């Protein structure tokens with residue numbers, strides 16, 4: 001019905017080998033080697049990001065889709081990729097990250113990247129039941145993908161319901177992941193939330209073509225329905241492909257080391 005639902009149907013109908021070739025074609029991918037060697041060798045000093053999510057956030061902060069500052073609350077922090085990146089920025093003074101944890105959910109990693117003394121991560125916290133607290137910058141990177149777009153719709157709306165109780169607290173910088181932004185219920189909800197709190201949808205090139213995630217960021221603007229559709233166009237055009245040239249590889253940036261005031 002929507003262009004994103006046609007992509008989802010086409011995606012579900014792919015073969016296992018076509019799936020692999022399509023999921024990384026033309027996407028931007030960072031180096032994870034220094035992160036994976038230090039992640040055994042005890043090197044919490046290397047400055048190598050703990051996850052790919054770190055490079056996804058730098059992509060938006062550098063293009064000023066979001067400008068972290070003050071107290072940052074990181075819902076669904078996982079290993080802490082967004083938390084340790086935000087701790088390097090000058091405007092940021094405190095980073096509080098929450099994540100579910102338990103079996104099958106990522107546990108926060110303790111690292112000594114630049115500004116690590118400002119990061120406090122607490123695992124074992126289901127965000128759907130945690131009360132909101134005052135903050136200046138709101139992150140939320142939650143959304144478990146599924147072959148059913150109907151499942152993703154219910155998971156996306158539940159997230160968008162939860163984050164609004166945090167946005168009513170006044171933060172004006174925010175970066176919230178929309179797992180399934182092409183379903184009609186999600187589009188209507190986003191227009192309502194965009195009216196009340198602002199922002200807009202953006203697609204990060206480091207995302208994989210195997211999912212339609214887009215981020216509701218405070219520094220974006222414009223028609224939400226169209227921004228989703230033009231992303232749905234690129235993804236479908238990447239499925240119809242003969243010359244599979246693969247991904248554009250890039251280097252991550254070093255987070256640094258040491259304490260901040």
Ligand SMILES: Nc1ncnc2c1ncn2[C@@H]1O[C@H](CSCC[C@H](N)C(=O)O)[C@@H](O)[C@H]1O
Nearest residue numbers: 051053076078080081082100105126127141
């Ligand atoms: N109800 C819930 N409450 C809290 N955390 C949740 C959750 N549902 C999923 N999660 C957690 O959200 C995390 C998304 S991982 C996001 C990557 C992170 N920004 C980084 O840069 O490293 C997952 O680890 C998941 O365990």
